[PDB]
């Protein structure tokens, strides 16, 4: 029964909550905002 439960539940990898160790990531941006609106007419072509 142990082997049957194993090979009939675990390989499916569904219906059971699965955990994994992942790394924290963070994103930063410069104080730059580029949106189309009235005024500040920009061709919106930037190099980085």
Swiss-Prot record:
Task: Quote the PTM field.
Answer: Channel activity is modulated by phosphorylation. Phosphorylation is increased in failing heart, leading to calcium leaks and increased cytoplasmic Ca(2+) levels.
When this gene is knocked out, what is seen? Embryonically lethal. Embryos die at about 10 dpc, due to defects in heart tube development. Cardiac myotubes display enlarged rough endoplasmic reticulum and cytoplasmic vesicles that contain high levels of Ca(2+).
According to UniProt, the tissues expressing it are described as: Highly expressed in heart, lung, cerebellum and brain. Detected at lower levels in adrenal gland, stomach, thymus, esophagus and ovary.
Q: Where in the cell is it found?
A: Sarcoplasmic reticulum membrane
Cleaved signal peptide residues: none
- Record's superkingdom? Eukaryota
User: What's said on domains?
Assistant: The calcium release channel activity resides in the C-terminal region while the remaining part of the protein resides in the cytoplasm.
Describe its partners and assembly state.
Answer: Homotetramer. Can also form heterotetramers with RYR1 and RYR3. Interacts with CALM and S100A1; these interactions regulate channel activity. Identified in a complex composed of RYR2, FKBP1B, PKA catalytic subunit, PRKAR2A, AKAP6, and the protein phosphatases PP2A and PP1. Interacts directly with FKBP1B, PKA, PP1 and PP2A. Interacts with FKBP1A and FKBP1B; these interactions may stabilize the channel in its closed state and prevent Ca(2+) leaks. Interacts with SELENON. Identified in a complex, composed of FSD2, CMYA5 and RYR2.
**Family named by the database record:** Belongs to the ryanodine receptor (TC 1.A.3.1) family. RYR2 subfamily.
Biological role stated in the UniProt entry: Cytosolic calcium-activated calcium channel that mediates the release of Ca(2+) from the sarcoplasmic reticulum into the cytosol and thereby plays a key role in triggering cardiac muscle contraction. Aberrant channel activation can lead to cardiac arrhythmia. In cardiac myocytes, calcium release is triggered by increased Ca(2+) cytosolic levels due to activation of the L-type calcium channel CACNA1C. The calcium channel activity is modulated by formation of heterotetramers with RYR3. Required for cellular calcium ion homeostasis. Required for embryonic heart development.
Please report the name of this protein according to its UniProt entry: Ryanodine receptor 2
Q: Which gene encodes it?
A: Ryr2
């Amino acid at each position: 029964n142990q082997h049957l439960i194993c090979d009939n539940l675990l390989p499916g990898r569904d219906l059971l909550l699965q955990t994994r160790l992942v790394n924290h990531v963070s994103s930063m941006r410069p104080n730059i905002f580029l949106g189309v609106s009235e005024g500040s007419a920009q061709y919106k072509k930037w190099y980085y």
